[PDB]
Structure formats: C-alpha cells, structure tokens
Amino acid sequence: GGCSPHYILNTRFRKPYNVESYTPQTQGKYEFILKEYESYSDFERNVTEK
Amino acid sequence: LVCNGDSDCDEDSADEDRCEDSERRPSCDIDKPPPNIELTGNGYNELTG
Numbered sequence: 001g002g003c004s005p006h007y008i009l010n011t012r013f014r015k016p017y018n019v020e021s022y023t024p025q026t027q028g029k030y031e032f033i034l035k036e037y038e039s040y041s042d043f044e045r046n047v048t049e050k
Numbered sequence: 051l052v053c054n055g056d057s058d059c060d061e062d063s064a065d066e067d068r069c070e071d072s073e074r075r076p077s078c079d080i081d082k083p084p085p086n087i088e089l090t091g092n093g094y095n096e097l098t099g
C-alpha cells in the first residue's frame with residue numbers, strides 16, 4: 001500500500017514499505033589548503049696570492 | 051476519514067483499501083505539501099545538534 005504523496009521538487013515519489021524516510025537534506029562542505037615553501041642559499045669566495 | 055481519497059493511515063493507507071473511485075470524493079484540488087515540510091516532522095538531538 002503506502003501511496004502517501006512524497007515530493008522532491010516537482011517530482012513525486014512512492015516510498016518503499018521498508019524505508020522510513022528518504023529526504024533531500026542538502027549540504028555541502030568545500031575545503032582548500034595550499035602551502036608553498038621556498039628556500040635558497042648561495043655561497044661564494046674569491047681568493048688570490050701573488 | 052475512510053475513502054477520503056487521502057491516505058490518512060500513515061504508512062498503511064488501510065483507510066483506502068478496496069475503496070471505489072465512485073465513492074472517493076474529490077477531497078482537495080491538490081496534494082503537494084510545502085516544499086520540505088517533512089523536515090518539520092523530524093526529531094532533534096539537542097546534545098549533538
């Protein structure tokens with residue numbers, strides 16, 4: 001049996017006997033992490049004997 | 051409520067078994083509930099939110 005009116009947007013659904021609820025609890029979580037690292041090190045010498 | 055053409059038994063709709071469409075009245079023009087009213091039915095866990 002069943003045949004209670006269940007809608008999502010304009011689309012109407014027939015729920016299974018087994019299912020208590022199927023309901024559009026919409027949600028969204030985005031997550032962005034960017035980590036850039038640089039190191040440089042320079043070493044020189046110049047040395048002369050005459 | 052029997053043979054309203056509305057399923058007034060919640061899950062079973064037993065008030066609408068073997069019910070003649072000649073006896074079913076046009077109980078209402080429409081049956082679309084407000085667009086997410088079922089969520090108002092839900093319970094809430096006040097600790098976990």
Ligand SMILES: *[C@@H]1O[C@H](CO)[C@@H](O[C@@H]2O[C@H](CO)[C@@H](O)[C@H](O)[C@H]2NC(C)=O)[C@H](O)[C@H]1NC(C)=O
Nearest residue numbers: 038039040041042043044045046047048049050
């Ligand atoms: C070692 O000597 C070289 C050559 O003089 C140096 O490089 C020169 O540096 C001058 C000034 O900055 C520039 O005008 C030249 O074009 C460079 N030439 C070359 C080939 O690099 C260098 O800097 C010196 N290093 C140290 C640690 O003294």
